Write a protein that binds this ligand. Structure first.
Ligand SMILES: CSc1nccnc1CC(=O)N1CCC[C@H](C(N)=O)C1
Ligand SMILES: [Zn+2]
Length: 139
């Protein structure tokens, strides 16, 4: 679990969104596993606007942050699950690192701010749904 709070927005994994998230929906993309909902309270996370390929992510299944090198946002095939059939997930970045299903929502950050959130994993790999292209999160 976990979310990004920026301005009057809350960014979560779309497969983990609540009824509240859906009742206050701003935008969602099943292909990116992202959903943004509106909040009344003001959020203070800074979104990075960069092409960084190194950062630190939070791994709740280990209660630790880990430094990682990660690939460029791209279309990566993701196995069928209880939330989605077998498909390509766009805007996904992979890194060698530990993750488990409860790890989705952990933030990935570089020196510039929030890069994205844990969205996929398996076999010593961890996938992050990128948010740096969502320029509207700041306006
Ligand atoms: C950190 S998630 C994880 N980690 C290890 C093993 N398995 C997983 C599970 C996993 O990847 N998914 C299940 C939830 C929906 C995800 C998606 N974005 O389509 C795919
Ligand atoms: Zn950066």
């Amino acid at each position: 679990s976990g979310a990004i709070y920026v301005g009057n927005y809350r960014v979560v994994n779309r497969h983990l969104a609540t009824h509240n998230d859906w009742a206050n929906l701003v935008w969602e993309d099943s292909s990116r596993d992202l959903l943004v909902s509106s909040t009344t309270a003001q959020g203070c996370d800074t979104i990075a606007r960069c092409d960084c390929q190194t950062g630190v992510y939070y791994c709740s299944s280990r209660r630790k942050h880990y430094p990682v090198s990660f690939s460029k946002p791209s279309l990566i095939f993701v196995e069928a699950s209880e939330y989605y059939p077998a498909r390509y997930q766009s805007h996904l970045m992979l890194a060698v690192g530990h993750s488990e299903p409860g790890d989705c929502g952990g933030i990935l950050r570089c020196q510039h701010g929030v890069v994205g959130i844990v969205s996929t994993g398996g076999n010593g790999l961890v996938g992050f749904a990128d948010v740096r292209d969502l320029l509207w999160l700041d306006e």
